[model samples]
Target chain A: LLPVPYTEAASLSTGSTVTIKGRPLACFLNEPYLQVDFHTEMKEESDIVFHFQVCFGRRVVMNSREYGAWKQQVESKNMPFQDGQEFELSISVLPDKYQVMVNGQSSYTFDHRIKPEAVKMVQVWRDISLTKFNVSYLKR
Target chain B: LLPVPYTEAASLSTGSTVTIKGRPLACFLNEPYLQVDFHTEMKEESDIVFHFQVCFGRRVVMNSREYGAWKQQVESKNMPFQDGQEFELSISVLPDKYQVMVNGQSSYTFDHRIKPEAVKMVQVWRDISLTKFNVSYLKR
Candidate 1:
C-alpha cells in the first residue's frame, strides 16, 4: 500500500497536468476528507497557489493562500466521487484557470489566483490511500 | 515511519488514560496539526464524545458532536507542544473532565460533555507521525 500523505517536488506551467490515482480511506457516509495543495516552495508553510479539498460525498472547497493569508475561497456542492471507489483525478493548468478532471470528466475549475509557474511542490494528503502520482512533462 | 492517520477501537471510563507519542510532520513555522477524537462508534461519522484538535504553535480546539451536529467549541491558547520535537501526550479520564498532559505536564482539560464510557473508538490523525498509542487497563 502507498502512503496517505504523499509529497513530491513539482513544477507547473500552462501545459502541465497533475495526475493522481487514489481511494478514500473511509466510506462516503463517514465524510472522509482529501486535500491537494500546490505550494510555491517545498516547505509546508510556503504560499499555496492552489488548495483543493474534498469532503467525500459532500462538498469541495478551493482556495489560495498568499503570504500566510488565504484568499477568496470557492466551494462546490458537486459530488463526482463514488463511495469506496478508486478515483483518477487530474488537474490541468490552462492560461486562465486550472481544469479538474475526475475519471476523465471535467468536474471543476479554478481561476488563476497566482501563476502556475510559481509552483514548486505538490502535496496530497488527508484520508486517502495514494497509489499513483505524476506531473506531466509535456509543457513546452 | 508510522502512519499519519491512526485509528483504534477503544474504551474509556473513569480513571482510564490514553497515551500517544508522536512528532509533527512539519515544523512550528509551517503550522502542523494534531487531532484526537473519541467516537461513540467505530464508524468515522459516528457521534464524538470528545474532539481535541491542536494547531501546533497556534491554538487548540475542543468540542463534541452529537447527532451529527457539533456542540459549543472550546478554544485554548495554551500550547505545550515543542517545535520540531517528538511529543508524549496523555489524556486521563476523570469523573467530571478529561485532563490532557503533554510531556508529563498538565496542559489542558475539558469537562465531560458525554460520559467517558460512551467512547468506543479513538482516532489520532492529521499532520503528525505516530509512534506509540496505548490505553491504560488499570480502570476499576
Candidate 2:
C-alpha cells in the first residue's frame, strides 16, 4: 500500500499506538506533503484528532479541522524529514498530547483537541506510500 | 510466534524504523525480560546500536552492551510498560541518536556511541512474541 492514498481504518484507544512505514515517492520534489488523519466521522464537519502532514517543501504542518475550521501549527525548526526518503511515523496517544515520532526522533506533539476514544478511523494520503500500517493494544 | 524467541538479522539503515509488536506474556512473572539487539557481528566483538530491553521485576533495566561491556543505565522514574498487555515497540535510527518509542510514547533516547551503519543485523528475543516486523525504504 506504499503509494496508496489510504489504508484500512483500525480501532483506536487512548493507549493505542499506530505505526506507518513507507517512503515518500521519487517525485518527492513535486509531491511534498503526506497526511495521516484520525477522524471520528470522516466527513466534512468531522472532528480530527490529528492531521499530520510532512511538508517537504520547507515547513512541516500538523493541524486539526473541526467543522471546517482548520489548523494547529507548532514550531518545527528541525523537521528531520528527507525528500524521496523512507520514513516511519509513529503516533502514540497520551492522556493529553498525541506523541509523534518521525524516522526515530521526536518530531512534534499534537495536543488532544478531541478525545481519541471518539476517533473511529485513521487515514493516510497525499505523497507517501505505506508498506505497513497497524494499530495494536491490550484490553484493560 | 507468541512463545518463540525472535531471532532474525535484518538489514538496516540510518533512517529505518524497526517496529516490534508483542505482549508481555500473561505469565510475566516468570518471563522477566525482552531484548532487541542491533549488532555489528551479532557476537561478542560486535558493537550494539541499541540493546532495547524491558526488564520486568521488582527493579527494571533498559541498557545496551558494546564489545561485551554493559552500558546505558538511564534514570526513568516510571517504566511505561503494562503487564500482560500488548505494546508497539518502535526504534528509529538517526545520524546522531537512536530514537525509541514504546506504546506510542518516547520512552528514552540513546546516543550514537557506535555508528549505526557498522552495527547492523537486528535481533529480538526473550519474553515478547513479535507479531509484525518489516522495513521500508526510499530510493537511494
Candidate 3:
C-alpha cells in the first residue's frame, strides 16, 4: 500500500485527470473519512483550489479556500462508495468544472472557483489507505 | 508506530482508567482528526457509551449513542495538543463523569450519560499513529 497521508506535486489543465485507488481504513459504519485537496502551493497551509472531503457512508463536502478564507461550501449526499471495499476515484479538470468519478461513475462536480492551472500540489489524507495515485501526463 | 484503527475489549468502572499514547498523522494545518469510542458491544455499529472526537488544533466533541441515537453533544475549544509533538491521553471514570487529561493536564470532561460498565469495547481510530494503549486492571 502507499502511505495514508500522501502528497505530490502536479500540473493540471483541461485534459488533466487525477486518479486515486484506495480503501477506507475502517468501515463506513465507523465513519471513516477521505480528503483530497488541490493546493496552490507545496505547503500544506497553502490556498486550496478544490477541497473534497468524504465522510464515508454519510456525505461529501466540497469547497475552495482563497486568500486564507474558505468560500461557500457545497455538501453532497450522493455517495457511490461501497462500504468495506476498495475504490477508484478520478477527478478530471474540464473547461468549467471538475468532475469526480467514483468506481467508474460520475459522482460529483464543482464549478471553477479557482482555475485548475493554479494547483501546484495534491494532498490525499484522512482515514484511508492509498494504493495507487496517478496524474495523467499524456498531454502538455 | 502501532497500527491505527486500533480496537480492544475493555472493562470499566468508577475507578477504571484508560491511557493512550499516539501522535497525529498529519500537521495541525491539515486538520487531522482522532476519535476514540467506548462501545456497549464489540461490533462497530453497537451503541456507544462515550464518543470522543478531536479535530487536532481546532476543537473537541463529546457525545454518546443510546439505542442507535446520539444524545446531547458537548463541544470545547481547549486544545492542549502541540502541532507536531506526540501526546499522552488518559481518561478516568469517576462516580458521575469521565475526566480527560491531555499530556497530564485536565482538558475536558463529560458527565456520564450511561454507566461506564456499559462499555465492552474501545475503538481508537482516524488520522493517528498509536504507540501505546492500556486499561487499569487493579480492581474490578
Question: Fraction of reference contacts reproduced per prediction?
Answer: 0.50, 0.00, 0.67
Q: lDDT by residue for model 1 over A43-133, one digit each (tens)?
A: 8889999999998999999999999888899999999999999999999999999999999999999999899989999999877888899
Q: Could you arrange the candidates by lDDT from highest to lowest?
A: 3, 1, 2
Q: Which ten residues in a row have the lowest lDDT in candidate 1 chain B?
A: B25-34
Q: List, residue by residue over A55-88, the lDDT tens digit for candidate 2.
A: 5646667777676566655646556777657888
Local error of candidate 2 at residue B72 (angstroms): 52
Query: How far does residue B136 in candidate 2 sit from its true spot (Å)?
Result: 39
DockQ of each candidate relative to the true complex:
0.43, 0.01, 0.65
lDDT of 1 at A80: 90
Q: Candidate 2 — which residues are off by over 4 angstroms? A: A42-45, B1-140
Deviating ranges (above 4 Å) for candidate 3: none
Residue A38 in model 1: lDDT: 98
lDDT of 1 at A137: 95
lDDT score for residue A10 of model 3: 87
Report candidate 2's interface RMSD in Å. Answer: 19.3
Sort the predicted structures by DockQ, highest score first: 3, 1, 2
TM-score of chain B of 1: 0.97
Better of 2 and 3 by DockQ: 3
lDDT of each: 0.89, 0.66, 0.93
